[PDB]
């Protein structure tokens, strides 16, 4: 006689929202490293030319320092072009070992459709007594496999960066079936020397990757402008 019957009707109240695709990506990258002894390092977004450039082996005359690529407040204070100045602040504060990942908002002047005046990047650093290029190759290759959840082919090409020597541009499969996803290299001796780390005793490797770039490859996002627009028709797709 228990005629208190009812249906398959949707539940009552509020359900969960979601995170931003970039936040998911930053979190995921951090986890690949924090699981193997890396500490998450943070610093200011408004930096000085020493931490942002000089200390990273970028001299005065260097085209990156120019107002055509860097946002300035005055002659010494600027908006950070990379998260590497956090690595400097770390190297100045402590002595090796150093295993840090630097996620954060970075600012480039020269913006368009394929580039944003604000974006996020994760920059890693490892400084110890016997670090090789084989060590870096191994780290990068296993990180990309873990991140992209596939046993993909990883290619290293020689490139230039003022703060790393030797340096490389890292490619993964899928016009030549290769995609430039990140940059890395062995920390340049002058970089260590400047931050009072003896390069004769200590060696190190650094790497960098674009958060939005990775998020676009992973999720199939075409327009970089979608990230900063915050349309719910876009955001709601990452619940």
């Amino acid at each position: 006689a228990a005629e208190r019957i009812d249906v398959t009707l949707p539940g009552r109240g509020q359900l969960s929202g979601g995170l931003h695709p970039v936040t998911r990506t930053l979190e995921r990258i951090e986890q690949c490293f924090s699981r193997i002894g890396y500490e998450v390092a943070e610093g200011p977004e408004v930096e000085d030319d020493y931490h942002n450039f000089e200390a990273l082996n970028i001299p005065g005359h260097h085209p990156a320092r120019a107002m055509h690529d860097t946002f300035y407040f005055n002659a010494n204070m600027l908006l950070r072009t990379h998260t590497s100045p956090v690595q400097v602040r770390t190297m100045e504060s402590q002595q090796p070992p150093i295993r840090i990942v630097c996620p954060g908002r970075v600012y480039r002047c020269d913006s368009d459709l394929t580039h944003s005046p604000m974006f996020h990047q994760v920059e890693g650093l490892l400084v110890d007594e016997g670090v090789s290029f084989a060590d870096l190759k191994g780290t990068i290759e296993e990180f990309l496999r873990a991140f992209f959840e596939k046993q993909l082919e990883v290619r290293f090409r020689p490139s230039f960066f003022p703060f790393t020597e030797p340096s490389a541009e890292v490619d993964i499969q899928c016009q030549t079936g290769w995609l430039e996803v990140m940059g890395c290299g062995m920390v340049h001796p002058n970089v260590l020397r400047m931050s009072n780390i003896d390069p004769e005793k200590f060696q190190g490797f650094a790497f960098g990757m674009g958060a939005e770039r990775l998020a676009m490859l992973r999720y199939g996002v075409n327009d970089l402008r979608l990230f900063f627009d915050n349309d719910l028709r876009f955001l709601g797709q990452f619940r």
């Binding site: 228990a2 005629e3 208190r4 019957i5 009812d6 249906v7 398959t8 009707l9 949707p10 539940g11 009552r12 109240g13 509020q14 359900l15 969960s16 695709p21 998911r24 995921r28 986890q31 690949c32 490293f33 699981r35 193997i36 002894g37 191994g138 780290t139 296993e142 990180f143 873990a146 991140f147 959840e149 992973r218 999720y219 199939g220 996002v221 075409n222 979608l226 349309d231 028709r233 876009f234 797709q237 990452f238 619940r239």
Partner: protein
């Protein structure tokens, strides 16, 4: 293992305080569990002799004594029933400070002068014996301080031994350790052979030489068992928690606690044609000295004669064979029993003795002779008699042998994280009586002493080195790791994540017992045979749970019965499905809710929780890894749930779990007057989700149309919505059910469903004609499938 510190120090004195010794012991693997003084403090009490006693002339209950302290005679009045001439007793002189600030003064008891006091053990805090005065031995030294004589300046130490240190189950083993720890000389008891006064012997046969490779037997004739156990032995045993029973058992216990050799004495008269050490026959019956009638197995070693089994070898003696009032002659036994052969045998008959324990843990295979000579001297000194020659039966081929171990210095360094000097390695191992001999560079050959049954490998030697050097003295390093970046897949709802969601969604986590009452099991799982325990703790904890619901419902009513009205709980754990052959151990997430929907507040509706409140909690969990679409709630039935309010949750036709209101009949049975909503999910079916696949956003507006639909009251809202998506076309961006009507405005067998339909074209604007054309075909489809009408 309990012992007298004074007794241990008489063998190996570490030359440190009691506190220092008790500290170091636990620090080396001999954890002190107790360290208590043997007696209360007092001064001025000496051994006195009663010379005479006269009846007090003015008090019948009193006596007037003449007592000597070896220097002078004093008159002392005494009311003790045992006071009489020739008694050696504790004489408390005038001036003497007794326990609990009791000062002895001059007294004139009923007109008679008294120059001191005679004591009982209680008055001196020696024992609880207050019946009368502490009758000291006939040979006690008059004048000697009672504390000096009774060795009251002592502590008893109790060590909780590890099963690998069977060698420390004696004062001999413990003293050997102290000598090793402190690098101090070891002074063992010198045990001289007792010469045979006659040639009477009994034949011994080793019928099971593998179980007993050595057995010693000796005839001791014409013993006076009326004679008492001496005080020094009684005290030494008492200080090791061994009760004095009779001289003969007291000696064989004393020898076992002094040297570590369990020994036994039989009434010679009870031995029919000599000893036969053999395995028991299947169904052989023996009555033990305690009266227990044991029915033996062929795997048990017994000490028998030519007629019958006399005792269970190494564990306990028989009633018939043991010492009695009639006993005039003894037959002593000291033997080595193989640890493997004895392992668990005493326990298998429900027995545990000091003998069984020691033999199982290992008794020095060479000790039997020293112990036999020691027991002989003590027996002759305590009960007299004439010793015969020792009969030693031994099987060399069955005697225990530990092959020499090769110890490498590199391995010690590796394991310890630091190198030890060859002299240190040698000195340390030699103190443990190990035979260290060089075997080339940075390598030795070490031989194991007969009392150690735990050493056989190189690691055991390194352990000993670590132990003696000091665990806390050793270095500290963090292990090296060749680590590579790694991470679990992105699109997965792990249990830690799901828990935090439920916490945020207003739930309290519960942990219930996996074993529940079989009657409770049957209520939620009728006709199902639970996986039942053979040895449950109680009967109400005998069934392995097939659901977390019984345990949750129980925790819910525990709270309800404790002035709680709003109970929101969740638990994660294993369910156990089927019998051992085919048993499934599946991780479940379950939740139980009752009371008001919201907590008591000014801004909150006073409505009670319902089915759809629990459904939202489930929906949120199922949506956690972006795969909510893969799940479907279909009308179902569960024996523990209300058949009108039950949903079967499915993923690709596979069962995920159930969500429903607890069955009213079950609530009645459990005395629950409130509606309760349950859910249980197979976590294996919830974890996998989908990774975001980006779909391009349109630059064009969306078009919305609302449809009010009259349908059969019993047709499920999900079937209608499914049919709408089927007819809505490729541009439908959203479909919401914003109202359900079942009232006066329409037929009582019908219901009006208010649905909102949203459309967006990715490359242009939508015209009214096409949108109205789509709306009409959706309607026509519903008219033909469910006989739907528009309001």
């Amino acid at each position: 293992m309990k012992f007298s510190e004074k007794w241990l120090r008489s063998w190996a004195n570490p030359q440190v305080s009691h506190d220092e010794l008790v500290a170091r012991l636990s620090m080396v693997g001999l954890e002190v569990d107790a360290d208590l003084p043997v007696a209360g403090a007092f001064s001025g009490v000496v051994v006195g002799e009663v010379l005479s006693t006269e009846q007090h002339p003015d008090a019948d209950k009193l006596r007037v004594c003449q007592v000597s302290n070896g220097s002078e005679t004093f008159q002392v009045v005494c009311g003790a029933p045992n006071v009489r001439a020739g008694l050696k007793i504790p004489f408390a002189m005038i001036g003497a400070e007794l326990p609990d600030d009791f000062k002895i003064k001059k007294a004139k008891l009923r007109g008679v002068e008294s120059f001191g006091m005679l004591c009982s053990a209680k008055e001196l805090q020696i024992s609880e014996e207050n019946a009368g005065l502490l009758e000291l031995p006939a040979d006690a030294p008059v004048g000697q301080d009672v504390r000096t004589y009774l060795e009251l300046a002592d502590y008893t130490i109790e060590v909780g031994l590890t099963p690998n240190r069977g060698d420390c189950l004696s004062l001999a083993g413990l003293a050997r350790e102290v000598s090793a720890i402190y690098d101090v000389p070891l002074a063992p008891v010198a045990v001289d052979a007792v010469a045979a006064q006659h040639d009477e012997t009994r034949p011994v046969e080793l019928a099971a030489p593998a179980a007993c490779p050595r057995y010693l037997g000796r005839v001791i004739r014409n013993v006076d068992l009326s004679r008492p156990t001496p005080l020094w032995m009684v005290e030494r045993l008492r200080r090791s928690d061994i009760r004095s029973i009779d001289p003969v058992v007291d000696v064989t216990n004393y020898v076992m606690i002094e040297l570590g050799q369990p020994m036994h004495a039989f009434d010679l008269a009870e031995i029919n044609g000599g000893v036969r050490v053999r395995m028991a026959e299947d169904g052989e019956k023996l009555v033990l000295l305690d009266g227990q009638e044991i029915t033996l197995r062929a795997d048990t070693l017994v000490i028998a004669d030519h007629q019958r089994a006399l005792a269970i070898a190494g564990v306990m003696g028989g009633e018939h064979s043991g010492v009695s009032d009639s006993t005039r002659d003894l037959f002593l036994e000291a033997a080595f029993f193989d640890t493997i052969a004895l392992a668990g045998k005493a326990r298998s008959y429900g027995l545990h003795t000091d003998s069984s324990h020691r033999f199982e843990r290992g008794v020095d295979s060479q000790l039997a002779r020293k112990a036999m000579e020691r027991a002989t001297r003590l027996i002759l000194d305590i009960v007299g008699g004439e010793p015969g020659p020792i009969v030693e039966q031994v099987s060399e081929a069955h005697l225990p042998k530990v092959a020499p171990i090769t110890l490498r210095a590199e391995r010690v360094t590796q394991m310890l994280g630091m190198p030890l000097d060859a002299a240190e390695i040698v000195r340390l191992l030699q103190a443990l009586e190990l035979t260290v001999v060089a075997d080339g560079e940075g390598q030795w050959s070490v031989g194991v002493p007969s009392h150690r049954f735990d050493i056989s490998l190189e690691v055991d030697l390194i352990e000993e080195l670590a132990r003696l050097y000091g665990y806390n003295r050793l270095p500290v390093r963090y292990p090296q790791a060749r680590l590579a970046p790694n991470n679990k897949p992105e699109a997965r709802a792990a249990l830690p994540l799901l828990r935090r969601l439920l916490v945020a969604r207003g739930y309290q986590e519960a942990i219930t017992f996996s074993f529940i009452d079989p009657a409770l099991f049957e209520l939620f799982d009728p006709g199902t045979q639970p996986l039942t325990l053979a040895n449950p703790i109680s009967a109400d904890m005998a069934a392995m749970r097939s659901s977390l619901w019984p345990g949750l419902v129980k925790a819910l009513q525990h709270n309800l019965n404790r002035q709680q009205s709003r109970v929101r709980l969740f638990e994660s754990g294993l369910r156990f499905v089927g019998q051992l052959e085919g048993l499934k151990q599946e991780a479940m997430l379950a939740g139980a809710i009752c009371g008001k929907r919201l907590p008591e507040g000014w801004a909150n509706g006073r409505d009670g929780v319902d089915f759809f409140d629990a459904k939202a909690d489930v929906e949120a969990v199922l949506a956690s890894a972006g795969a909510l679409g893969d799940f479907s709630f279909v009308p179902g039935e569960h024996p523990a749930l209300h058949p009108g309010q039950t949903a079967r949750i499915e993923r690709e036709g596979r069962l995920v779990g159930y969500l429903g209101a607890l069955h009213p009949e079950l609530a009645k049975k459990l005395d629950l007057e409130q509606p309760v909503f349950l859910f249980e999910l197979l976590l294996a079916e919830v974890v996998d989700g989908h990774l975001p696949k980006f779909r391009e956003l349109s630059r064009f507006p969306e078009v919305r149309r609302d449809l009010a639909l009259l349908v059969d009251q019993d047709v499920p809202a999900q079937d209608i919505l499914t049919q709408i998506r089927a007819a809505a076309g490729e541009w439908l961006t959203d479909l919401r059910l914003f109202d359900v009507y079942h009232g006066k405005g329409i037929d009582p067998h019908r219901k009006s469903l208010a649905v909102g339909l949203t459309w967006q074209h990715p490359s242009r604007t939508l015209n009214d004609d096409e949108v109205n054309s789509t709306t009409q075909n959706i309607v026509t489809s519903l008219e033909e499938r469910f006989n739907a009408t528009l309001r």
